[PDB]
Amino acid sequence: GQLVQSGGGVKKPGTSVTISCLASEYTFNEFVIHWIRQAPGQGPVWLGLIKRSGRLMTSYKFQDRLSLRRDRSTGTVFMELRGLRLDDTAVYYCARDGLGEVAPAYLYGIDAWGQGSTVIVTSASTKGPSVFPLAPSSTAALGCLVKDYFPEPVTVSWNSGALTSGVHTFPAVLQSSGLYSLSSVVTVPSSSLGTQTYICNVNHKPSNTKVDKKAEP
Amino acid sequence: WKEAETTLFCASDAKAYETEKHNVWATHACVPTDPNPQEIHLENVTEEFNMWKNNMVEQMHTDIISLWDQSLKPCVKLTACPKVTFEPIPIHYCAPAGFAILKCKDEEFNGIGPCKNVSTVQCTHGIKPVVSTQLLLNGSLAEKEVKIRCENITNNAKTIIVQLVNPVKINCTRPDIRQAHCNVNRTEWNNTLHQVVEQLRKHFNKTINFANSTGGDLEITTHSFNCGGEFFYCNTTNLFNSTWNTIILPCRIKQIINMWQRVGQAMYAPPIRGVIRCESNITGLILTRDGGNTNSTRETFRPGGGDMRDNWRSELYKYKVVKIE
Amino acid sequence: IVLTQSPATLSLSPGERATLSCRASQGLNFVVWYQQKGGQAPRLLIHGPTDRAPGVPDRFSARGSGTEFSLVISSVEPDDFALYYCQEYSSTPYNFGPGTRVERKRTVAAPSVFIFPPSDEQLKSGTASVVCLLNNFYPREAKVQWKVDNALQSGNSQESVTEQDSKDSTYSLSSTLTLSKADYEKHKVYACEVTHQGLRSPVTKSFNRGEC
Ligand SMILES: *[C@@H]1O[C@H](CO)[C@@H](O)[C@H](O)[C@H]1NC(C)=O
Ligand SMILES: *[C@@H]1O[C@H](CO)[C@@H](O)[C@H](O)[C@H]1NC(C)=O
Ligand SMILES: *[C@@H]1O[C@H](CO)[C@@H](O)[C@H](O)[C@H]1NC(C)=O
Ligand SMILES: *[C@@H]1O[C@H](CO)[C@@H](O)[C@H](O)[C@H]1NC(C)=O
Ligand SMILES: *[C@@H]1O[C@H](CO)[C@@H](O)[C@H](O)[C@H]1NC(C)=O
């Protein structure tokens, strides 16, 4: 719309990542451009900014690993984040702000954002999930645990998609390995546990992996 | 009659026989100055000013932009480049009919807020549009003491503009055909740093330190300026290493420069052989403070620049426009 | 400076007046506010200085001074259920608040709690996952605590929570405690303890290793 960007993606730990942010001439000429990241389930974190003067400013907490630069030839701004760690995994935005520095109104406020660049730091390669069953108790609960796959997404259905009532498929969590894991559960009558057959159908397209696993007592 | 933004016009004593490009521009865009210019004092009147939220600055910026685009335009990045004579002349900005300029004559006006000894004028003083970073050259000086100005000193992101009261001559000279250098008196510069540290000290509460620029484009890390049509880039490391309770700066001329006025690049011919020398009055500085990680032992200030609006701001700070109705 | 927001969650019915709070460690002139929905970038609501950015509807207003600021939504619409962050400009680094989640109000609902031992299949892989499921509860705030033979497990479990269900306005939550096999084989009693408004005493669900 106003700010385009094209940052990297999967990075192995220890490496560096460079994210560019192509700006309109007006924004680039008149506005500040922040670099801001956001990890999953967390709020935004300010990393640094580039003023229209060319001044570079970085967050004290990233200054040893973070380098900002601007290209006055093309109207692009950049951030390089080095020594990547799994917890640098986040969506990275460049985003503009007049900062009381534009000519009319003199307003602060981040009014235009780039689309964001997702950076995932890990050493994991494409991998299909292992699907383990979560067996019913003694209303009963049953499910599938879909562990250790990369990258997203996996899809899960039950009984070939013929079971939607009372099903919860949790959003995936990224484990300390750098591989994902999720669970898919369903609540069902205790009377039907003896007779009704329950099968979760998992599909991880990125690895051409499809598994149908029946979890039973 | 309340502050209103409108297009001003400019006046100057440019010379029509002269192909010097400021004279050529001014001849077309500006008019001759009024022989006996009137200035009227406004008794019992207080009026607010804000140099950082001043449209006059923007108009001047736009004007100088069109000036460079008309006068200089060599080649690159998508496009003839004869050499040109470059030496800024003073420009006056004047109010049309139905408008008026208020001028703050208050001593030691820090740039923002109430001014009580306000007057009205037809034209601004003559302002030479000197393009420079980190140091302000050939500008105006506060009469009483150095004056430092900021939108909010506590916002480290916000630029600081220092106005000197004694000027410091700086002589730059080119007799490697691209190697040049600038000279200034050390003891007087030490004393300049001192008069700045005293005013910074008024705010701090903190022991002051000066460092060279941390990085960025060549234009803002060095003292970048024009001289005889050639673009100088001077290492200011020697001006800005200091800690508080003659100096030769090595310079380089660059053919490939960034255009301060738009995205792209300009490329010029190599400098002419022979004699290049500029003797300039250092009259102010643009500084930036690090913040974020200060420490009770050091406050770091570094040479700034890049947004030329601040250059204009250093001269237009005393003025505001109103719709006289 | 630092900004803190309250409450963590605001439960509201459509039509009700929402007021979100932002507190600053030192004196500020203003703060700006952002709305964020999942998967999208923040959307500026309130410019700085105040009041509100272009495109922002009338129901949005903001106020405060000094240390204290708030964002007010006069009559909440379905579109307004989202996360709201405040943001500060006093100096770098510019801090964002932790955010206040606005959700749909409902009658308190206790979770249905279930626990799942690691499968015999999984134990082969050399790892063991113990899962505690909390089904269809409200409000969203709930605390899970793991114990292995009365040893509090800290740092070695992970929780995941569904989005508020569009049909019954409840949440569900999983907590997975991860142990190696060797460590799992070494302990008998595995338990998860749940604390929640819908429970008058925290509820513990547990199992003994090797017993059906
Ligand atoms: C009052 O106006 C005079 C000019 O007549 C000016 O020099 C002086 O600075 C003004 N007053 C103050 C307190 O500055
Ligand atoms: C600037 O000067 C300092 C000290 O004189 C020197 O260490 C540095 O390398 C110089 N850099 C440039 C780009 O001139
Ligand atoms: C700035 O100073 C540092 C050391 O003081 C030096 O390493 C660097 O090259 C200098 N560069 C400029 C442009 O002053
Ligand atoms: C400064 O002024 C002198 C005399 O007015 C002039 O010769 C010189 O070229 C100017 N220098 C700059 C950098 O404007
Ligand atoms: C600068 O901003 C701070 C808070 O952001 C405020 O306390 C201070 O008063 C402002 N500056 C002035 C001159 O008021």
PDB file of C-alpha atoms in Angstrom, chain A:
ATOM      1  CA  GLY A   1       0.000   0.000   0.000  1.00  0.00           C
ATOM      2  CA  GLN A   2       2.710   2.448   1.078  1.00  0.00           C
ATOM      3  CA  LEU A   3       5.416   0.208   2.570  1.00  0.00           C
ATOM      4  CA  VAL A   4       6.424  -3.090   0.905  1.00  0.00           C
ATOM      5  CA  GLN A   5       8.920  -5.517   2.480  1.00  0.00           C
ATOM      6  CA  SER A   6      10.597  -8.834   1.804  1.00  0.00           C
ATOM      7  CA  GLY A   7      12.285 -10.378   4.821  1.00  0.00           C
ATOM      8  CA  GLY A   8      13.657 -13.895   5.146  1.00  0.00           C
ATOM      9  CA  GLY A   9      11.933 -16.873   6.708  1.00  0.00           C
ATOM     10  CA  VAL A  10      13.398 -20.010   8.242  1.00  0.00           C
ATOM     11  CA  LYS A  11      16.819 -19.314   9.712  1.00  0.00           C
ATOM     12  CA  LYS A  12      19.156 -21.700  11.486  1.00  0.00           C
ATOM     13  CA  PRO A  13      20.252 -20.485  14.918  1.00  0.00           C
ATOM     14  CA  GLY A  14      23.402 -18.388  14.908  1.00  0.00           C
ATOM     15  CA  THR A  15      22.852 -17.042  11.450  1.00  0.00           C
ATOM     16  CA  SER A  16      21.820 -13.525  10.566  1.00  0.00           C
ATOM     17  CA  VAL A  17      18.763 -12.252   8.728  1.00  0.00           C
ATOM     18  CA  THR A  18      18.363  -9.122   6.663  1.00  0.00           C
ATOM     19  CA  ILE A  19      14.970  -7.581   6.049  1.00  0.00           C
ATOM     20  CA  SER A  20      14.352  -4.855   3.515  1.00  0.00           C
ATOM     21  CA  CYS A  21      11.486  -2.382   3.377  1.00  0.00           C
ATOM     22  CA  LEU A  22      10.694  -0.655   0.102  1.00  0.00           C
ATOM     23  CA  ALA A  23       8.968   2.642   0.707  1.00  0.00           C
ATOM     24  CA  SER A  24       6.980   5.146  -1.375  1.00  0.00           C
ATOM     25  CA  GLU A  25       9.016   8.245  -2.190  1.00  0.00           C
ATOM     26  CA  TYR A  26       6.810  10.401   0.058  1.00  0.00           C
ATOM     27  CA  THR A  27       6.970   8.130   3.100  1.00  0.00           C
ATOM     28  CA  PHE A  28      10.711   7.606   2.576  1.00  0.00           C
ATOM     29  CA  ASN A  29      11.306  11.354   2.157  1.00  0.00           C
ATOM     30  CA  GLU A  30       9.081  12.679   4.931  1.00  0.00           C
ATOM     31  CA  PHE A  31       8.522   9.986   7.579  1.00  0.00           C
ATOM     32  CA  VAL A  32      10.340   7.977  10.202  1.00  0.00           C
ATOM     33  CA  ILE A  33      10.337   4.235   9.708  1.00  0.00           C
ATOM     34  CA  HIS A  34      10.337   1.993  12.760  1.00  0.00           C
ATOM     35  CA  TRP A  35      11.406  -1.644  12.756  1.00  0.00           C
ATOM     36  CA  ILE A  36       9.101  -3.538  15.078  1.00  0.00           C
ATOM     37  CA  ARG A  37       8.768  -7.240  15.735  1.00  0.00           C
ATOM     38  CA  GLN A  38       6.055  -9.329  17.349  1.00  0.00           C
ATOM     39  CA  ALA A  39       6.498 -12.849  18.679  1.00  0.00           C
ATOM     40  CA  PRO A  40       3.428 -15.156  18.989  1.00  0.00           C
ATOM     41  CA  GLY A  41       1.063 -14.392  21.879  1.00  0.00           C
ATOM     42  CA  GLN A  42       3.133 -11.367  22.869  1.00  0.00           C
ATOM     43  CA  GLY A  43       2.781  -7.667  22.262  1.00  0.00           C
ATOM     44  CA  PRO A  44       4.922  -5.514  19.921  1.00  0.00           C
ATOM     45  CA  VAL A  45       8.580  -4.717  20.556  1.00  0.00           C
ATOM     46  CA  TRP A  46      10.334  -1.635  19.213  1.00  0.00           C
ATOM     47  CA  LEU A  47      13.673  -2.569  17.696  1.00  0.00           C
ATOM     48  CA  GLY A  48      14.859   0.626  16.012  1.00  0.00           C
ATOM     49  CA  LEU A  49      14.020   3.446  13.610  1.00  0.00           C
ATOM     50  CA  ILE A  50      15.312   5.430  10.678  1.00  0.00           C
ATOM     51  CA  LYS A  51      14.551   9.133  10.531  1.00  0.00           C
ATOM     52  CA  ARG A  52      14.152  11.011   7.252  1.00  0.00           C
ATOM     53  CA  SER A  53      17.487  12.725   7.952  1.00  0.00           C
ATOM     54  CA  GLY A  54      19.194   9.375   7.709  1.00  0.00           C
ATOM     55  CA  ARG A  55      19.709   9.071  11.444  1.00  0.00           C
ATOM     56  CA  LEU A  56      19.777   5.505  12.634  1.00  0.00           C
ATOM     57  CA  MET A  57      18.630   4.560  16.110  1.00  0.00           C
ATOM     58  CA  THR A  58      18.564   1.094  17.606  1.00  0.00           C
ATOM     59  CA  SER A  59      17.208  -0.423  20.792  1.00  0.00           C
ATOM     60  CA  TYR A  60      19.877  -0.773  23.472  1.00  0.00           C
ATOM     61  CA  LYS A  61      18.770  -4.373  23.846  1.00  0.00           C
ATOM     62  CA  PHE A  62      19.537  -5.265  20.203  1.00  0.00           C
ATOM     63  CA  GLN A  63      22.403  -2.917  19.410  1.00  0.00           C
ATOM     64  CA  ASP A  64      25.061  -5.666  19.508  1.00  0.00           C
ATOM     65  CA  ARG A  65      23.176  -7.883  17.040  1.00  0.00           C
ATOM     66  CA  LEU A  66      21.156  -5.317  15.082  1.00  0.00           C
ATOM     67  CA  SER A  67      22.227  -3.095  12.234  1.00  0.00           C
ATOM     68  CA  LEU A  68      19.998  -0.649  10.411  1.00  0.00           C
ATOM     69  CA  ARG A  69      20.686   1.035   7.138  1.00  0.00           C
ATOM     70  CA  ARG A  70      18.979   2.975   4.434  1.00  0.00           C
ATOM     71  CA  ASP A  71      19.537   3.059   0.704  1.00  0.00           C
ATOM     72  CA  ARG A  72      19.024   6.567  -0.592  1.00  0.00           C
ATOM     73  CA  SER A  73      19.453   5.335  -4.183  1.00  0.00           C
ATOM     74  CA  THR A  74      16.191   3.333  -4.224  1.00  0.00           C
ATOM     75  CA  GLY A  75      14.259   4.452  -1.153  1.00  0.00           C
ATOM     76  CA  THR A  76      14.607   1.243   0.791  1.00  0.00           C
ATOM     77  CA  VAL A  77      15.365   0.770   4.471  1.00  0.00           C
ATOM     78  CA  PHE A  78      16.896  -2.355   6.026  1.00  0.00           C
ATOM     79  CA  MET A  79      17.396  -4.175   9.319  1.00  0.00           C
ATOM     80  CA  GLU A  80      19.942  -6.936   9.888  1.00  0.00           C
ATOM     81  CA  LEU A  81      19.497  -9.137  12.951  1.00  0.00           C
ATOM     82  CA  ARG A  82      22.505 -11.333  13.733  1.00  0.00           C
ATOM     83  CA  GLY A  83      23.197 -14.234  16.071  1.00  0.00           C
ATOM     84  CA  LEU A  84      19.656 -15.445  15.589  1.00  0.00           C
ATOM     85  CA  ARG A  85      17.993 -17.380  18.348  1.00  0.00           C
ATOM     86  CA  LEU A  86      14.783 -19.364  18.478  1.00  0.00           C
ATOM     87  CA  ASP A  87      13.272 -16.538  20.527  1.00  0.00           C
ATOM     88  CA  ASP A  88      13.998 -14.033  17.762  1.00  0.00           C
ATOM     89  CA  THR A  89      11.215 -15.904  15.985  1.00  0.00           C
ATOM     90  CA  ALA A  90       8.599 -13.307  15.226  1.00  0.00           C
ATOM     91  CA  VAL A  91       6.804 -11.261  12.605  1.00  0.00           C
ATOM     92  CA  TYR A  92       8.975  -8.322  11.688  1.00  0.00           C
ATOM     93  CA  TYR A  93       7.325  -5.117  10.479  1.00  0.00           C
ATOM     94  CA  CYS A  94       8.717  -1.935   9.101  1.00  0.00           C
ATOM     95  CA  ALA A  95       6.239   0.817   9.748  1.00  0.00           C
ATOM     96  CA  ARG A  96       6.160   4.542   9.238  1.00  0.00           C
ATOM     97  CA  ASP A  97       5.467   7.412  11.580  1.00  0.00           C
ATOM     98  CA  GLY A  98       5.470  11.174  11.163  1.00  0.00           C
ATOM     99  CA  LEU A  99       6.681  11.509  14.755  1.00  0.00           C
ATOM    100  CA  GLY A 100       5.553  15.174  14.965  1.00  0.00           C
ATOM    101  CA  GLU A 101       7.944  15.730  12.048  1.00  0.00           C
ATOM    102  CA  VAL A 102       5.636  15.798   9.003  1.00  0.00           C
ATOM    103  CA  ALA A 103       4.570  19.237   7.847  1.00  0.00           C
ATOM    104  CA  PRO A 104       0.865  19.387   8.417  1.00  0.00           C
ATOM    105  CA  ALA A 105      -0.635  18.538  11.829  1.00  0.00           C
ATOM    106  CA  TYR A 106       2.710  17.304  13.272  1.00  0.00           C
ATOM    107  CA  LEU A 107       1.207  14.043  14.476  1.00  0.00           C
ATOM    108  CA  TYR A 108       2.778  11.003  16.151  1.00  0.00           C
ATOM    109  CA  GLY A 109       1.326   7.566  15.484  1.00  0.00           C
ATOM    110  CA  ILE A 110       2.214   4.567  13.350  1.00  0.00           C
ATOM    111  CA  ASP A 111      -0.382   4.883  10.617  1.00  0.00           C
ATOM    112  CA  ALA A 112       1.011   2.606   7.870  1.00  0.00           C
ATOM    113  CA  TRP A 113       2.519  -0.831   8.319  1.00  0.00           C
ATOM    114  CA  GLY A 114       4.373  -3.080   5.930  1.00  0.00           C
ATOM    115  CA  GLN A 115       2.801  -6.539   5.448  1.00  0.00           C
ATOM    116  CA  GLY A 116       5.281  -8.082   7.883  1.00  0.00           C
ATOM    117  CA  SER A 117       8.086 -10.589   7.450  1.00  0.00           C
ATOM    118  CA  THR A 118       7.861 -13.810   9.413  1.00  0.00           C
ATOM    119  CA  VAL A 119      11.217 -15.039  10.721  1.00  0.00           C
ATOM    120  CA  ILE A 120      11.407 -18.509  12.263  1.00  0.00           C
ATOM    121  CA  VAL A 121      14.722 -19.448  13.772  1.00  0.00           C
ATOM    122  CA  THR A 122      15.406 -23.153  13.837  1.00  0.00           C
ATOM    123  CA  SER A 123      17.548 -25.925  12.468  1.00  0.00           C
ATOM    124  CA  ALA A 124      14.586 -28.106  11.660  1.00  0.00           C
ATOM    125  CA  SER A 125      14.067 -29.360   8.140  1.00  0.00           C
ATOM    126  CA  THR A 126      10.721 -30.301   6.619  1.00  0.00           C
ATOM    127  CA  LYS A 127       9.323 -33.154   8.736  1.00  0.00           C
ATOM    128  CA  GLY A 128       6.013 -34.947   8.977  1.00  0.00           C
ATOM    129  CA  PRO A 129       4.406 -35.235  12.416  1.00  0.00           C
ATOM    130  CA  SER A 130       4.228 -38.187  14.718  1.00  0.00           C
ATOM    131  CA  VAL A 131       0.601 -38.766  15.725  1.00  0.00           C
ATOM    132  CA  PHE A 132       0.068 -40.379  19.113  1.00  0.00           C
ATOM    133  CA  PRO A 133      -3.363 -41.183  20.578  1.00  0.00           C
ATOM    134  CA  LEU A 134      -4.972 -39.670  23.673  1.00  0.00           C
ATOM    135  CA  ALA A 135      -7.121 -42.546  24.933  1.00  0.00           C
ATOM    136  CA  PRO A 136     -10.527 -42.050  26.643  1.00  0.00           C
ATOM    137  CA  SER A 137     -10.899 -42.016  30.454  1.00  0.00           C
ATOM    138  CA  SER A 138     -12.222 -44.744  32.792  1.00  0.00           C
ATOM    139  CA  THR A 139     -19.100 -37.291  29.072  1.00  0.00           C
ATOM    140  CA  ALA A 140     -15.665 -38.520  27.970  1.00  0.00           C
ATOM    141  CA  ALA A 141     -12.664 -36.854  26.324  1.00  0.00           C
ATOM    142  CA  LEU A 142     -10.486 -38.343  23.559  1.00  0.00           C
ATOM    143  CA  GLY A 143      -7.953 -37.082  21.049  1.00  0.00           C
ATOM    144  CA  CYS A 144      -4.796 -37.088  18.940  1.00  0.00           C
ATOM    145  CA  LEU A 145      -1.459 -35.544  19.870  1.00  0.00           C
ATOM    146  CA  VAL A 146       0.277 -34.309  16.688  1.00  0.00           C
ATOM    147  CA  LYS A 147       3.951 -33.810  17.603  1.00  0.00           C
ATOM    148  CA  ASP A 148       7.197 -32.761  15.926  1.00  0.00           C
ATOM    149  CA  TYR A 149       6.477 -31.527  12.419  1.00  0.00           C
ATOM    150  CA  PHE A 150       7.841 -28.658  10.388  1.00  0.00           C
ATOM    151  CA  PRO A 151       6.787 -26.301   8.891  1.00  0.00           C
ATOM    152  CA  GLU A 152       3.112 -25.455   9.298  1.00  0.00           C
ATOM    153  CA  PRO A 153       0.402 -26.322   8.516  1.00  0.00           C
ATOM    154  CA  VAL A 154      -1.099 -29.683   9.384  1.00  0.00           C
ATOM    155  CA  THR A 155      -4.815 -30.317   8.987  1.00  0.00           C
ATOM    156  CA  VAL A 156      -6.801 -32.712  11.142  1.00  0.00           C
ATOM    157  CA  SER A 157     -10.291 -34.166  10.762  1.00  0.00           C
ATOM    158  CA  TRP A 158     -12.187 -36.952  12.550  1.00  0.00           C
ATOM    159  CA  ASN A 159     -13.898 -39.970  11.030  1.00  0.00           C
ATOM    160  CA  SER A 160     -13.123 -38.702   7.534  1.00  0.00           C
ATOM    161  CA  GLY A 161     -14.585 -35.321   8.479  1.00  0.00           C
ATOM    162  CA  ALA A 162     -17.870 -36.856   9.630  1.00  0.00           C
ATOM    163  CA  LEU A 163     -17.326 -35.596  13.209  1.00  0.00           C
ATOM    164  CA  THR A 164     -17.372 -31.835  13.939  1.00  0.00           C
ATOM    165  CA  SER A 165     -19.630 -31.613  17.005  1.00  0.00           C
ATOM    166  CA  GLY A 166     -17.590 -30.736  20.097  1.00  0.00           C
ATOM    167  CA  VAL A 167     -14.153 -30.943  18.501  1.00  0.00           C
ATOM    168  CA  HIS A 168     -11.274 -28.607  19.490  1.00  0.00           C
ATOM    169  CA  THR A 169      -8.038 -28.505  17.485  1.00  0.00           C
ATOM    170  CA  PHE A 170      -5.561 -26.355  19.355  1.00  0.00           C
ATOM    171  CA  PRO A 171      -3.290 -23.946  17.562  1.00  0.00           C
ATOM    172  CA  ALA A 172       0.163 -25.393  17.143  1.00  0.00           C
ATOM    173  CA  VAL A 173       2.930 -24.530  19.543  1.00  0.00           C
ATOM    174  CA  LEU A 174       6.557 -24.280  18.532  1.00  0.00           C
ATOM    175  CA  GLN A 175       8.654 -26.550  20.769  1.00  0.00           C
ATOM    176  CA  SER A 176      12.245 -26.062  21.971  1.00  0.00           C
ATOM    177  CA  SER A 177      13.415 -28.348  19.181  1.00  0.00           C
ATOM    178  CA  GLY A 178      12.213 -25.922  16.537  1.00  0.00           C
ATOM    179  CA  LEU A 179       9.460 -28.331  15.559  1.00  0.00           C
ATOM    180  CA  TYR A 180       5.761 -27.866  16.059  1.00  0.00           C
ATOM    181  CA  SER A 181       3.283 -29.842  18.085  1.00  0.00           C
ATOM    182  CA  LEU A 182      -0.450 -29.617  18.630  1.00  0.00           C
ATOM    183  CA  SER A 183      -3.321 -31.590  19.997  1.00  0.00           C
ATOM    184  CA  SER A 184      -6.772 -32.240  18.609  1.00  0.00           C
ATOM    185  CA  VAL A 185      -9.487 -33.296  21.040  1.00  0.00           C
ATOM    186  CA  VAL A 186     -13.176 -34.176  21.107  1.00  0.00           C
ATOM    187  CA  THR A 187     -15.812 -34.654  23.803  1.00  0.00           C
ATOM    188  CA  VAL A 188     -18.282 -37.517  23.382  1.00  0.00           C
ATOM    189  CA  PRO A 189     -20.991 -39.510  25.200  1.00  0.00           C
ATOM    190  CA  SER A 190     -19.748 -42.245  27.504  1.00  0.00           C
ATOM    191  CA  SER A 191     -22.409 -44.635  26.163  1.00  0.00           C
ATOM    192  CA  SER A 192     -20.911 -44.492  22.654  1.00  0.00           C
ATOM    193  CA  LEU A 193     -17.333 -45.236  23.804  1.00  0.00           C
ATOM    194  CA  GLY A 194     -17.900 -48.981  23.680  1.00  0.00           C
ATOM    195  CA  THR A 195     -19.292 -48.994  20.154  1.00  0.00           C
ATOM    196  CA  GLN A 196     -18.351 -45.823  18.298  1.00  0.00           C
ATOM    197  CA  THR A 197     -14.998 -45.913  16.510  1.00  0.00           C
ATOM    198  CA  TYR A 198     -13.062 -42.637  16.536  1.00  0.00           C
ATOM    199  CA  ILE A 199     -10.291 -41.954  14.006  1.00  0.00           C
ATOM    200  CA  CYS A 200      -8.355 -38.724  13.578  1.00  0.00           C
ATOM    201  CA  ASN A 201      -7.226 -38.016  10.029  1.00  0.00           C
ATOM    202  CA  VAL A 202      -4.050 -35.897  10.004  1.00  0.00           C
ATOM    203  CA  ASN A 203      -2.468 -34.383   6.891  1.00  0.00           C
ATOM    204  CA  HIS A 204       0.846 -32.572   6.637  1.00  0.00           C
ATOM    205  CA  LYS A 205       0.968 -31.532   2.998  1.00  0.00           C
ATOM    206  CA  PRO A 206       4.498 -30.018   3.126  1.00  0.00           C
ATOM    207  CA  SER A 207       5.837 -33.572   3.579  1.00  0.00           C
ATOM    208  CA  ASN A 208       3.138 -35.491   1.655  1.00  0.00           C
ATOM    209  CA  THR A 209       2.365 -37.089   5.002  1.00  0.00           C
ATOM    210  CA  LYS A 210      -1.177 -38.262   5.714  1.00  0.00           C
ATOM    211  CA  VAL A 211      -1.995 -40.417   8.741  1.00  0.00           C
ATOM    212  CA  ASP A 212      -5.302 -41.758   9.971  1.00  0.00           C
ATOM    213  CA  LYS A 213      -4.945 -42.805  13.612  1.00  0.00           C
ATOM    214  CA  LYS A 214      -7.694 -44.461  15.665  1.00  0.00           C
ATOM    215  CA  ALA A 215      -7.337 -43.624  19.342  1.00  0.00           C
ATOM    216  CA  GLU A 216      -9.166 -46.181  21.491  1.00  0.00           C
ATOM    217  CA  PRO A 217      -9.095 -47.603  25.058  1.00  0.00           C
TER     218      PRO A 217
END
